[PDB]
Amino acid sequence: SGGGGGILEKLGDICFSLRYVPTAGKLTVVILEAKNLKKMDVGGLSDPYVKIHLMQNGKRLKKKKTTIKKNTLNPYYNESFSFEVPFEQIQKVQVVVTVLDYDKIGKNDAIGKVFVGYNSTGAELRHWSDMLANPRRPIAQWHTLQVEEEVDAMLA
Template sequence: LTVGILQAADLMSMDSDPYVKIQLLQGGKRLKKKKTTVKKNTLNPYYNESFSFEIPLEQMQKILVAVTVFDYDKIGKNDAIGKIFVGSKATGLGLKHWSDMLANPRRPIAQWHYCILLISVL
C-alpha cells in the first residue's frame, strides 16, 4: 500500500508549520505510522511525499488509514488541524477513495478530502 501526501490547502491559521501523520489501523490498534516533513510558515503546504506499507492482500479489507494534519510546535504539544479516514471501515469519501483504489490495482487514485489535503492511494 502506498499513500501519497500531495498537498494541503486553506488550513486553519495556527502557527502555520503543518505536517501530516499517516497511521495504519486494524481493529482499533495502530500497526504502523509515518509522517511528512514539517512545512514552515504556510497554510497551503506542498508535500509530494509517498509512504509505502507492506500489507498482505488478505489484510487490505481490514486496514483503516488515518491521515491527520498537525501544526508543529517546538515547545508543547502539536495541535491537530484535521483528520480523515480512508479504508473499508471509513464512510463517505474515505470509503469511496478506498473502493476506487481496490478496483484499480497499481494505479494511483488521487482525491481531495474536505479541503484539508490531497492524497493518493495505490
C-alpha cells in the first residue's frame, strides 16, 4: 500500500531489473526501457538517457549513466550496471534512477526520477523487497517517474 506520488505527473515510466547477491555484495541494475516520456525539445521529442546513483544519508556515493537515445519518447537501453554494497548495508541504501534529456549545449534537464531502497514506498518498496527476498534472482518492474523536486526532498 501507499506511495504513488508521481502517478498523475505524466512524466513517463521506466522499467529496470534489480538483483542482489548477498555473499558477494553485488547489486546489479539493468535499465531496460522507458515509455511515455515527457517531450523536452521544442518542435521535437526528447534525447533520453538514464542516470543511476547509489546513495546513503543524502550523499551520492556512485554515479553511472546509459548511452543517449535520439529523438524518442520510448527508448530501449538494455544496459547493465553493478554496485558493491555489503549485506550489512543493503537495507540502508537507495538506488536512484533519473531519466534526462540530452542537450548538446546547456544543462541536461531531468524528465523525472524514482528511487528504491531505504525510505522507498509503494511500488518502489515492493521492487526492493522482492529483490531482497530472492537472492541472486533479477526482478524486473515498471516505475512511474516523479518530479525531481519531490524525489530530491525525500533523498536529502
